Structure formats: C-alpha cells, structure tokens
Write a protein that binds this ligand. Structure first.
Ligand SMILES: [Mg+2]
Ligand SMILES: [Mg+2]
Ligand SMILES: [Mg+2]
Ligand SMILES: [Mg+2]
Length: 755
C-alpha cells in the first residue's frame, strides 16, 4: 500500500477504511491465492496474523507508520484468522475488526455455511444492527430451506408480516432488511410450510429473548453494549496450561443460589427491570440479576477460595424445572436474570477477581416446544428424521442431525460464540454417552447400527472431535470437560491420538466409590477399602476431574451431611474427611453450592439455598474448613502441578483395611514441596501410628481436618513431628503420629527447622 493511503487511515481522511483494512485478495495462483491482511492498531508495537485452524502464525510488518500493519499470506482460502496485538509488555488476540464489510450474507458466507464451516455464522444469521442502502436498521436472516414463505413479525409492524416478507437466497436462507428499527425490537419469524400451515418461531440465532414463558426474540447490538476490562486475564489464560494449575470449581445453578424480593424491581447494570417471579407457588420471591449475582456471588466465591465458577446451563430454556438442560435459545443467555450486557459484566467481574467461568453446554438434544428448533421449516431440519437416531424417547426430546452441515455449523459456531462474545473460560458437556451411541436408551429392534455394524454414532463422534479441535485452536488455555458414563476410551486425549479432545473428564467411578464408602457405617468400611484405593488403578488413562455434583444431592439421595452415618459430630467429621481426601487425591476438583456450608436438605431448584444455617457455629466452621482448604490447595504445588504424572502420587500404605487408614505422597518439581497425607476413616483415634516418610527431618502438621476451628475434637500432633530413623513402609524414615478421628492430616518437611 502507498504512504498516502496509510496517512488517510491514520488521520481519518479515508472515505471507507474497509477498502484497505481487513483481508483482501491480491492474486490467484494455480493452486493457491495470495492475500494481504492490514490493520491499524494505534499504540501497538507488533502484531501477528494467527490462522488457528491451520496452526500457523505470521508476523505483520509496520508499513509507512509504526502502527499501520500488513501481512501477506499465501493459502487457498483465508476464512479463519485472528490478530495478535502487542502493546507494551501485553498481548491480546482478537477477531479482525474489519473482517466483514457488509451486514448481509455474501456468497462466501453462504458457501461456507453450506459446507458446515462458517465459524462466525452468527455474525450474519439472526438479527444485526447495520446499514444497507444508506439507511440504518436491522438485518434479519434465517435458515429455512423448505419453507414456502417467511415473514418478520414484531412490535414494529403490530405482528402483521405482510409488508415484511423475507427474500429467499440460494434456495436456503431467508433475509430481510428493515429500516429505522434497532436494538430492543421484539420479533419472531412467521413461517409457512409446504402444506400451507402458518406458525411462529423464535430466532434460532437470537441474542436475547423475552422472559419465559414468553418467547419473542429481541434485537441486541451485541458489540456495542459492554466494555470489557479482562485483557490481562485473557492473556494469562492463553499463555498457561490449566492442567498444571489448581482448578477448584464451585458449581452453581443461577436460578436457585439466592433469591430476592419480588416487591421491588430487578436492578441491572446501570438500569432496572420488572422482577422475574420464581414461581406461582412462591410469588414473593424473584431471581437475582446477572448484575446482583456479580455483586454477591463473585465476592462469596473469591472469599471461599475457589478458582472457577461452573454454571448449569444459562442458554435460554423455557422450563425452570429442566435446570437448563432443555434449551431452546442456544445463542442467548437466559433473560430470567437480565440482559446480555449484564452477563458480560458478570464474566468481566469474575476475571477482575481472578475467577474463571465454565458453562454447561448442551449440544446433545433439544425439546419439542413449538417456538424452538423442532420441525423448523415443516421438515425434520435440526433433528434427524429417523426417530431411531433423532429422538430420545425416554426423555421426550429430539436429537440434532450432527451429519447435516448447517446443523453441525449451528452447534460448532455456538460453542465458539460463548468464548467470543462472552469470554468464558471453559465448557462442560453432560451425558456425552447420549451422543456417542446409536443404541442409547433404545431396546433391541428399535435402533440401527452404523455403516460398519457397530453401535458408535459416527457423525456425533466426528462433531465432538471438531468442536474440541476448534475450541483449543481458537482459545488455547480453556477447559473442555466431559461427563461420559460408559468407559468410552480416550475421552480427554487429543483427537490426533484417537481421543475425543476434551482436556478433563469427570471421574464418575470415583464419585460413586467415595459416596458409597462414606455412607457405610465406619466399622464396616474395613470390607470396602477397595472403594478408597481402586480409582488409582485406571486414573492415568484420562485427565480426571473429581466432581461431587448437583446430581448427587437430589432425588432422595440426601445432601452431603445426610449421607453420612453417626451422630451430628461424626456426620460433620465424615464430610471434612471426605473433602480433605478429595482435595489431596490426584485430579482437579468440583463441588456444588450448599455442600460448602452443610445444608441438610436436598437441592431444590424451585427455592434458594438455606442461607439461615450460616447463623450457626457448626455450618460456619464447615465453611471455614472449605475456605482454608481452598487456600491450601492454591498454596501447595504438590496438590496441583503433577496431577496427571506418576511422579505426583505414590501410596505409602493402603493395606490397613481393618482400621480404614491409608496414606500417600504428593509431589511437585521441588522435592521439598512433597506432602505426606494420612487418612483415618473411622472414629477411633490412634495415639501412635507409624507412617514411613522419605527423608529425615521435622514434618510440620500443615493441615488437620479435626482442628477445633473446623468443628473437630482438636486432636493431632501439636505442630508436627520429627521423623525417626526407623524403616517403615519400605522407606528409611518414619513418623509416629497421632491420628485424629474421622480425619485427614497433611504434613510437609520443614528442612530449615532447628534440631
Ligand atoms: Mg397475520
Ligand atoms: Mg446423567
Ligand atoms: Mg464394592
Ligand atoms: Mg430460601
């Protein structure tokens, strides 16, 4: 480019910067093309063009001015890229601001979507504020290839679409530009199908929606509603390996954590709205907004010391009682809690406080509600037409046709959407088996095998692999977590090794082993020592997340304290021992709201948590226990650097079943960070119990779950213990410990203690 053109950009004299900024074709070769990407990045000293899906990165060069950049790249197609931008000592990765020069669908947009590969399709499908023919308005576009007609109905035309009939492009997508309307417009699509039947649909790509049970979509100017401040968080994420860090997740259902009063408005970020009543049977209660949750949940979690919040599904869903698992508005955070910018504020505030946000994401099915995706255009569009693979009959829901390009594209682009627009730090997928098996919850003669005679759902496996390939190319540093309950192999292994590409998997066998174990009267635990130790036999086959989830404290299963045998003291003690063991056992951690303060009742999605319990000492003490344990977890490298390597763990002795005692080491890079963990899973204290340790020296009692401040009896080793030169458990030195009842000790060598 010339200096004259650069200066026109720098000094804001250029008539249309899209002519020169962004990606432009320079020339076509026999088997490739040559492209230039240009950027004006004021205050940046350096920039690169990332082609994440090709795993390439090319420096940009300053051209005529230090903040004007260009990059020439040869490749057959340049559809997917990001800009990495360095300003002083800091780097950010963004999409190119000049990527899309028009609001309408191009030929190229249509071709990529037809192939399933438009990773940013939600920039053009749905409703977007823009300018066409010189006039500002909203562009609508919807995929409905078999419809006879589609019209936009909304507030602006009194729900009469006769003068807002859409235009069908390429036999597949309907579009319309409507001048002089903007954000806040309420609308739906009115479709006529091939039989002439007329019906109304929410926008599949809608960004905001009325409050259930109303279903109209609402136009959002999604790139001009919120200013983020989380660049430094995002940079550290992108440059870190979360597998080598502490990951302690507080799992939360936003609708049921805490309620407010329905006698006042719901406050929003700089505004307010009418209250959303929780139910007709509890009409004095309203949900808290994303804004109020930022102000209340986030400091709560920060003070408790968790690293992450994991949300049950926040995508728009019509029925509270699904918990969010039956979604009908995949591209919008639920309007129960306010507006898109309120949830952006929530995420940005998590990041400001050094807390990550993981979303439960639900690609496995969708319910039949008539406003939603079902039978969208008068055919089986999103769902497969064959009920043997397109319906989950025991659930009453429909299964996406994962092989159909535009359906795959809806979902792949949807996962990316949440990382793009809402800056989230991970996803978790529930019931992955529901996708993976063609015979899932189906009887003989009511499913059909894949093309090779097997039960593997080939199209779903392919989709899962593509989601995880893409996610980690575009957003390295994220968490992609699976719950898969059939022993499918290599869930949390790279796709290039035959894995599904997740980076963590819930250890459901561990969860069952533990909860079953702790439910056993302690005298009987000697017949079930294997529940304590067995999960280490298969542990290195996956990267495991140790999750005690919402699903374990509903349906007659009791909350944690209720599962435990004994008197009230011992129930509490069992909880502390279990969770100290969980936090010292190799793997990342997840626990659900209410578990941290000892709620007695089961989780009820229709009310809020029993916060009044925190007026009482025993619940206070258990919450202090968790606070301290999360602090310890972040402070001790041996609890998190080598979770997934042999080096990070070794049993000292796990044979004493008769006393339900086990002990082990955790290790990190520095040998002086090694930890000795000793567990006593009966209420019998031991005044002298010998444990082998690898070095001479003084072993500080770094944590003791029977401490009085946690509600325990305060038994233990008074600060720590000198090791004896007395071989034990095949180690040269040994500690003669006092083991408190129903309790876990963590000890650590202080190699500078004065003898
Ligand atoms: Mg009408
Ligand atoms: Mg399940
Ligand atoms: Mg058993
Ligand atoms: Mg309540």
């Amino acid at each position: 480019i010339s200096a004259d053109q650069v200066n026109q950009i720098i000094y804001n004299l250029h008539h249309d910067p899209f002519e020169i900024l962004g990606c432009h074709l320079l020339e076509e070769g026999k088997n490739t093309k040559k492209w230039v990407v240009r950027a004006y990045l004021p205050k940046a000293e350096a920039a690169w063009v990332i082609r994440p899906t090709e795993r390439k990165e090319d420096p940009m060069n300053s051209v005529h001015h230090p903040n004007f950049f260009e990059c020439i790249i040869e490749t057959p197609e340049l559809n997917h890229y990001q800009l990495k931008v360095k300003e002083g000592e800091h780097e950010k990765v963004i999409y190119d601001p000049y990527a899309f020069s028009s609001p309408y669908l191009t030929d190229e947009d249509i071709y990529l979507f037809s192939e399933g590969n438009h990773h940013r399709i939600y920039e053009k499908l749905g409703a977007h504020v823009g300018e066409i023919n010189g006039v500002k308005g909203v562009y609508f576009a919807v995929w409905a290839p078999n419809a006879r007609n589609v019209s936009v109905i909304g507030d602006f035309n009194n729900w009469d679409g006769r003068e807002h009939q859409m235009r069908k492009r390429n036999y597949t997508i309907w579009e319309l530009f409507v001048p002089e309307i903007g954000s806040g417009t309420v609308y739906k699509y009115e479709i006529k199908n091939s039989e002439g039947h007329i019906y109304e649909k929410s926008d599949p790509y809608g960004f905001y929606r009325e409050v259930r049970p109303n279903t109209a979509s609402i136009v959002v100017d999604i790139d001009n509603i919120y200013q983020w401040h989380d660049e430094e968080w995002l940079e550290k994420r992108r440059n870190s390996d979360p597998l080598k860090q502490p990951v302690s997740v507080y799992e939360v259902h936003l609708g049921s954590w805490l309620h407010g009063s329905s006698a006042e408005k719901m406050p929003l970020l700089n505004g307010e709205a009418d209250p959303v009543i929780v139910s007709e049977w509890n009409p004095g209660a309203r949900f808290l907004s994303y804004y109020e949750l930022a102000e209340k949940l986030i400091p709560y979690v920060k003070d408790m010391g968790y690293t992450h919040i994991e949300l049950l599904p926040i995508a728009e869903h019509p029925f509270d009682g699904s918990w969010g698992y039956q979604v009908t508005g995949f591209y919008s955070p639920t309007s129960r809690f306010g507006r898109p910018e309120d949830f952006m504020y929530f995420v940005d505030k998590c990041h400001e406080n050094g807390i990550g946000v993981i979303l439960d994401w639900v690609p496995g099915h969708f319910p039949k509600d008539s406003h939603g995706l079902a039978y969208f255009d008068g055919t089986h569009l999103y769902e497969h037409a064959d009920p043997r693979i397109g319906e989950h009959k025991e659930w009453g829901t429909l299964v996406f046709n994962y092989g159909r390009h535009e359906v795959r594209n809806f979902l792949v682009a949807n996962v990316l959407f949440w990382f793009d627009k809402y800056h989230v730090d991970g996803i978790r997928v529930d019931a992955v088996a529901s996708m993976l098996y063609r015979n899932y919850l189906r009887k003989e003669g009511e499913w059909i095998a894949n093309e090779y005679g097997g039960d593997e759902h080939i199209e779903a496996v392919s989709f899962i692999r593509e989601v995880n390939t893409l996610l980690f190319e575009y957003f390295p540093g994220i968490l992609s977590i699976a719950e898969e309950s059939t022993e499918w192999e290599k869930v949390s292994r790279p796709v290039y090794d035959g894995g599904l590409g997740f980076n963590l998997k819930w250890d459901m066998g561990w969860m069952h082993d533990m909860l079953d174990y702790f439910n056993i009267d302690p005298y009987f635990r000697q017949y079930h020592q294997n529940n304590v130790t067995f999960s280490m036999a298969y542990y290195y086959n996956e990267n495991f997340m140790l999750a005690l989830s919402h699903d374990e404290i509903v349906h007659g299963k009791s909350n944690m304290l209720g599962k435990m045998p004994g008197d009230e003291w011992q129930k509490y003690a069992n909880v502390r021992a279990l969770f100290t063991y969980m936090y010292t056992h190799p793997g990342k951690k997840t626990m659900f709201m209410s578990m941290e303060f000892g709620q007695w009742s089961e989780w009820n999605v229709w009310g809020d948590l029993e916060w009044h319990l925190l007026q009482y000492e025993p619940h206070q003490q258990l919450k202090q226990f968790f606070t301290d344990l999360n602090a310890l977890y972040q402070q001790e490298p041996a609890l998190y650097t080598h979770d997934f390597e042999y080096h990070g763990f070794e049993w000292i002795d796990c044979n004493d079943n008769t006393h339900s005692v086990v002990s082990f080491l955790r290790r990190s890079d520095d040998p002086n960070d090694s930890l000795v963990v000793v567990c006593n899973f009966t209420p019998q204290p031991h005044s002298h119990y010998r444990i082998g340790v690898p070095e001479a020296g003084y072993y500080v009692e770094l944590f003791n779950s029977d401490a009085k401040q946690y509600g325990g009896s305060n038994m233990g080793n008074l600060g720590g213990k000198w090791a004896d030169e007395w071989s034990f458990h095949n180690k040269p030195y040994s500690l003669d410990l006092c083991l408190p009842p129903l309790a876990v000790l963590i000890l650590k060598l202080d190699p500078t203690k004065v003898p």
